[PDB]
Amino acid sequence: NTPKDQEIKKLVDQNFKPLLEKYDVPGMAVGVIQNNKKYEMYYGLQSVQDKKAVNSSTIFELGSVSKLFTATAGGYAKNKGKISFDDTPGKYWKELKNTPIDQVNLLQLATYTSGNLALQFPDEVKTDQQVLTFFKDWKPKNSIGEYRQYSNPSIGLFGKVVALSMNKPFDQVLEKTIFPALGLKHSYVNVPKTQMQNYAFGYNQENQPIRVNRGPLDAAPAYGVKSTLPDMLSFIHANLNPQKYPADIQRAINETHQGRYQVNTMYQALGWEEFSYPATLQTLLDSNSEQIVMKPNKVTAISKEPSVKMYHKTGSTNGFGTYVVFIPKENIGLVMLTNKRIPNEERIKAAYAVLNAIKK
User: Where is the Beta-lactamase-related domain (predicted)?
Assistant: First the structure.
C-alpha cells in the first residue's frame, strides 16, 4: 500500500520532474485535482538569483490560458443579458460601426473565424488609437465564419467588447467580478506592488530572467493574466463542478464548455479546446500542431455532440509555460506552470501519462 497523495506525487515526479533537467527549467508547479481533493507539487526556483523556491504563493504568467478567463467573462456577460453572441462589435465599440469588422459576430471573434485576423497584433500597434485603426482598416479575406485562424487580436476584441458591455475596463471585469466569483485570491491582470515578491521571473531560452511586457492594452484578454497554482486548481474545480457556484458564474462556466464547431477531432469551445473522451494522445497533440495553430482551417459543424468529453488549453509567454486539462466524468484535472517555455507536446504528453495512470 502507498497513500494516494504519494502515488500522485510519484507519477508527477516520473513524468514532469525530468522536464526540468531536460529543458533547463528553473521552476515548475504541478497540481492535480481528483474527486475534489487537491494535490500540489512545487519544484525548483521562482528566482534563480534569489534562490527563492517555487511555492503556493508563486505567481506565473498564463499566456494564452488567459483566454479561458476572457471566455468565462463573455459567458458571464451573455447570461446576464449584457451581450448576445450574435451581436457585432460596433454595437458596443461605436467607432467600429460602418466598418467591415462590424460584420463579424462576437462568437466568431471569440472562436477565431472572422476570416482575416492573424496570430498577433503587429508590433507597431501599441496605443488605443492604433488598435482602433487596426480594426478599422480590417477587410474580410475569407468568408466570415468559414475558417478558423488562431488569433490574439480576434479574442482581444471580444474581450474589449465584453468589458464595454459591462461598463468597466477589462482588468476590472476580471479582478473585481470574475476572479472573485470563481473564488480566486491571487490572480491578476496587473500584479500589485505587494505581490511583486511572489511574481516569478520568467526565463528565456538563454535562461536569462525576463517578464512579459509588450502588446497593447487590448491584448490582455488574449495573454495578460497571472495566477498561482492554488488559484488555477480552484479554476479547474469550478470547471469540474459548475453546479456548486452561483447561477451567473455557473452559466458562464457552462457557456465555455459548449463546443461551437469542429476542426477534425478538435471541438472549439469558448476558450477551451474540447475533445471526445477518451482522447488518443495524437488527438491532443494534433490540437497544437502547426497546421491547427498557425494556418487557417475550414470549420465544420459538430456532428457527434460528445456526451463524455475532456478539455484543455496550452499557453505560453516569452518566459513561461502553462497547460491546463480536465475530464468532467473522471472528476479529475491537472495544471502545469513553468517559468521557462517547454514544447507544448511535452506538456500534453506528461499530463496524459499522469492522468491515465492515476487510480480511479
Answer: 12-357
